[PDB]
Ligand binder design. Structure first.
Ligand SMILES: [Mg+2]
Lengths: 131, 415, 295, 34, 51
DNA sequence: TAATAGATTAGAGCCGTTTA
RNA sequence: AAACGGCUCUAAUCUAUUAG
């Protein structure tokens, strides 16, 4: 019989300097490290894709439950956890109405033109790809 | 009277008080944290009066270095002691020490006697300790709050210091043939003959045929090998190369260990032909799986090795590869081979993958252990070994009992 | 096949943090398998899903979800098959206790078809780039350059590393291998070996269980039986205890996901992701070198 | 030439921060000395 | 002379909104004329400056 | 150049969502 | 491509040897 040594599970620090092991519990307890004031979401997709993203963004705000909450922690809600606003009413939307190259080019050129020409600042562009 | 009152240092000790306050309301406890509940306009000290004296169930001090010398918190604490004397309830005050820069001998004499709940370096564990104290003192939605309460309790779940024992997947080589022999079949062995079709394991290396078998065994398929002089063959002690002290210009140590590994694998492949077990191809190597109906109730030693799933049949199968890095050992790998009706394999591989994933979805450690151990014990000949025919007089022994492991740290198995 | 990585590579020139979301992920209930349950059955994982996406968003909007808790640069380099492209990620601690978790980009190209090893010039370039990044960040050269990879280090590239490095720096090379067939079971209970166990095979090589059962979750990070990762200190001098501690620490920073831990160090995984993104499209000079543009 | 390198200092500082640094910046306030 | 224009031009390829502020603007009081009142007397327009 | 192994390595796909 | 895993398939390389 060979002995199995133990490496202690490391703890990741969080806001207020509180260190925990699971990402989920530390986030839902103390919140993230740095405060960003919000997420100005940009959405590049069809109108149906924008509607789907908006509905999911509304659903994120309220708590959403796993089937086994002990095995996998719940989501309290985006504002509860991260302390910043990621509302679906502040979305910068860019509608879309070698095949891989031009399919990438569509979303790409949309994003470059939005980031260059448009005044609306976007924190992160949510490319809602169709199916 | 049901209300938990939190006193703290207002100017510079707000974050902890706020977090604790909303945590306590999220747990169902009524709180009067001042920076969150002190109404604007009202006479603040008279409201503190009314809250502490009339309806405060328990009084909490935040005992940071900022506190314990500030006039507001000291007044609040002194009136808390007055309420303690009036109520005659033990530990009506529950001091909370967050700052680590003050010792227990610098805490003010007003609360130094009473035990402060540890908040120095873990707010969540200290909060769970506070919750346990509140439960002990019976301090007074039914599905939403229990998740947070159990998360507070569970955030610090660690491995308990208990002995745990484990069955591995490796199976050790008990013993090896004494001599690895290079026969000089310069012309007796046909050049274009395929030595993998030889009855016994043997491989063509450096105008030699190296194997664990006697030079006279390859006769039925190699008639010309007869009347071969035994002095031409060169024999090496197996343990000599396994320990690595053998090193010779004729054959390097690592290469000789590689050929022994190949011999072990080849011998396993030949043996499993005899062991009454069918075969299946992976992209890497062979899998040995038993037919349905060729085992009693599909069961060997109280372990079911084949069964049914969605009008298909699944069979437990193994794939063995010998290695000599840690010790002379043979690493097994467990797989599920799917057939249409128990006798005929399913040709397409995609359904094989899908059915294997579906079958292993609900299988876990105990199931895999029972199936692997039962399969190895089924292919075994004697009680504690399995035979590999590398020679008419030499065999390879693989132990039935895997390399057992043990550890000082483990857990309680959830019920 | 190459939608995501090529898209990220094309936006890579002008730094724009982007997150790709499939329609079947956000609203998985509507699109079905045409005969029953939805194609991506996310009912049991919805909140977890809502976790990861949110965390990903919070990372791509400039927010730091969590840190680690000195003087050691963790340099995970991964080889991409195209010629071979070595792309690295680096992780260390600054003087303000923050964890600098950039990449190490500007991929170095081995012309050989199957040699997953850096040529001496490219090895020197990679190591001096990482050391210069650490020097400009922490004002001083690292005490230990924990270089880990999925391949064994050859002699010439290790000599290049040791000659380009300066004095008072002991760089240690580690090889992390997945899917080694050491399936270690548990005889007593019905649950697998719990995460954190390490099997010290030799002084330089061991089997670390970076994933498995976790007491804190009353379940397993890995379905079926966990596969340990083989950790081998083939090059450099270090203790297997500290190396396994470092690997277990690095298995926490998967900002791309909200999961308790991943089976492999996050440095290797992030380096692999950025390398795939780089090799997806044409060459980019001085790429952004920050993970929000890749993951 | 002094203008070019003086601009280059602030420039490459901004580009490295926007490229390498994780923390997002909405607008960069170049505090030019006098 | 051409610091502002060149700096704004060189950041055009990698679009980064930038605002150039002089130390004599944000803190105008600290820089006198060695003889008296500061170079850039913003006292009457401090609110407007902030605006 | 082909082949026969063993050791490393690397890609892609594919299914399940971690036993209460 | 929310993600992490387990498995499946496939390819290449480095060795050692043999036939080209
Ligand atoms: Mg992602």
């Amino acid at each position: 019989m060979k002995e199995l040594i133990y490496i202690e599970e490391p703890s990741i620090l969080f806001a207020h300097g509180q260190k925990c092991t699971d990402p989920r519990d530390g986030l839902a307890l103390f919140g993230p490290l740095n405060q960003i004031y919000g997420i100005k979401s940009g959405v590049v997709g069809t109108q149906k894709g924008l509607q789907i993203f908006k509905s999911y963004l509304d659903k994120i705000q309220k708590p959403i439950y796993n089937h086994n909450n002990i095995t996998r922690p719940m989501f309290p809600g985006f504002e509860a956890v991260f302390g910043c606003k990621w509302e679906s009413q502040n979305i910068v939307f860019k509608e879309i109405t070698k095949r891989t190259y031009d399919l990438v080019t569509l979303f790409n050129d949309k994003i470059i033109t939005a980031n260059k020409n448009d005044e609306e600042r976007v924190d992160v562009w949510f490319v809602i790809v169709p199916e | 009277r049901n209300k938990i009152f939190i006193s703290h240092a207002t100017p510079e000790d707000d974050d902890f008080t706020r977090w604790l306050s909303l945590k306590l309301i999220g747990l169902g406890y009524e709180v009067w944290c001042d920076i969150l509940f002190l109404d604007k306009g009202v006479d603040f000290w008279s409201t503190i009066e009314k809250e502490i004296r009339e309806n405060t169930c328990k009084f909490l001090i935040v005992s940071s270095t900022a506190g314990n010398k500030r006039e507001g918190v000291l007044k609040e604490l002194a009136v808390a002691t007055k309420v303690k004397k009036h109520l005659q309830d033990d530990m009506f005050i529950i001091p909370l020490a967050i700052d680590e820069n003050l010792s227990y001998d610098d805490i003010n004499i007003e609360i130094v006697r009473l035990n402060a709940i540890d908040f120095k370096k873990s707010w969540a564990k200290g909060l769970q300790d506070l919750l346990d104290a509140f439960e002990k003192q019976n301090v007074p939605d039914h599905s939403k709050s229990n998740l947070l309460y159990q998360q507070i309790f569970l955030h610090d779940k660690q491995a308990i210091e208990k002995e745990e024992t484990y069955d591995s997947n490796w199976f050790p080589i008990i013993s090896f043939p004494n001599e690895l022999r290079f026969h000089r079949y310069d012309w007796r062995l046909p050049k274009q003959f395929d030595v993998r079709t030889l009855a016994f394991p043997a491989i063509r290396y450096k105008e030699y045929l190296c194997t664990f078998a006697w030079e006279y065994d390859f006769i039925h398929q190699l008639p010309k090998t007869e009347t071969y002089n035994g002095q031409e063959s060169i024999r090496i002690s197996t343990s000599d190369i396994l320990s690595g002290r053998y090193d010779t210009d004729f054959i390097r140590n690592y290469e000789c260990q590689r050929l022994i590994v190949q011999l072990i694998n080849k011998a396993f492949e030949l043996r499993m032909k005899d062991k009454n077990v069918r075969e299946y191809q992976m992209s890497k190597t062979f899998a040995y799986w038993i037919e349905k109906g060729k085992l009693e109730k599909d069961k060997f030693e109280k372990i079911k090795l084949v069964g049914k799933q969605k009008n298909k049949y699944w069979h437990f199968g193994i794939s063995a590869a010998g290695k000599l890095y840690p010790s002379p050992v043979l690493m097994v790998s467990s797989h599920i081979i799917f057939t249409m009706d128990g006798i005929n394999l399913i040709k397409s591989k995609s359904i094989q993958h899908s059915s294997r994933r579906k079958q292993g979805k609900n299988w876990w450690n105990d199931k895999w252990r029972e199936k692997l151990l039962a399969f190895i014990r089924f292919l075994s000949d004697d009680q504690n070994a399995i035979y590999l025919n590398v020679g008419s007089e030499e065999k390879i022994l693989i132990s039935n009992k895997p390399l057992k492991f043990f550890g000082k740290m483990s857990y309680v198995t959830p019920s | 096949a190459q939608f995501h990585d090529q898209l990220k590579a094309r936006l890579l020139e002008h730094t724009i943090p982007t997150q790709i979301l499939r329609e079947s992920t956000l609203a998985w209930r509507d699109f079905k398998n045409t005969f029953g349950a939805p194609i991506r059955d996310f009912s049991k994982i919805e909140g977890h899903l809502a976790w990861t996406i949110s965390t990903a968003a919070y990372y791509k909007a400039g927010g730091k979800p969590w840190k680690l808790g000195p003087g050691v640069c963790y340099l995970g380099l991964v080889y991409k098959k195209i010629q071979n492209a070595c792309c690295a990620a680096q992780m260390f601690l600054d003087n303000g206790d923050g964890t600098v978790f950039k990449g190490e980009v500007g991929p170095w190209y081995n012309p050989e078809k199957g040699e997953y090893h850096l040529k001496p010039k490219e090895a020197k370039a990679l190591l001096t780039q990482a050391l210069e990044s650490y020097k400009e960040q922490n004002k001083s050269y690292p005490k230990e350059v924990f270089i880990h990879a999925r391949t064994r280090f050859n002699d010439e590239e290790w000599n290049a590393f040791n000659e380009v490095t300066p004095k008072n720096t002991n760089l240690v090379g580690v090889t992390i291998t997945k899917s080694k067939p050491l399936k270690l079971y548990k005889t007593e209970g019905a649950f697998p070996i719990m995460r954190g166990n390490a099997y010290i095979v030799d002084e330089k090589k061991a089997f670390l269980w970076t994933l498995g059962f976790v007491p804190k979750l009353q379940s397993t990070l890995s379905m079926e039986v966990p596969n340990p990762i083989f950790i081998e200190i083939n090059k450099g001098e270090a203790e297997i205890q500290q190396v396994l501690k470092d690997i277990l620490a690095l298995t926490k920073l998967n900002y791309n996901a909200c999961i308790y831990a991943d089976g492999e160090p996050v440095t290797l995984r992030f380096a692999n992701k950025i390398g795939e993104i780089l090799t997806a499209s044409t060459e980019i000079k001085t790429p952004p070198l920050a993970f929000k543009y890749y993951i």
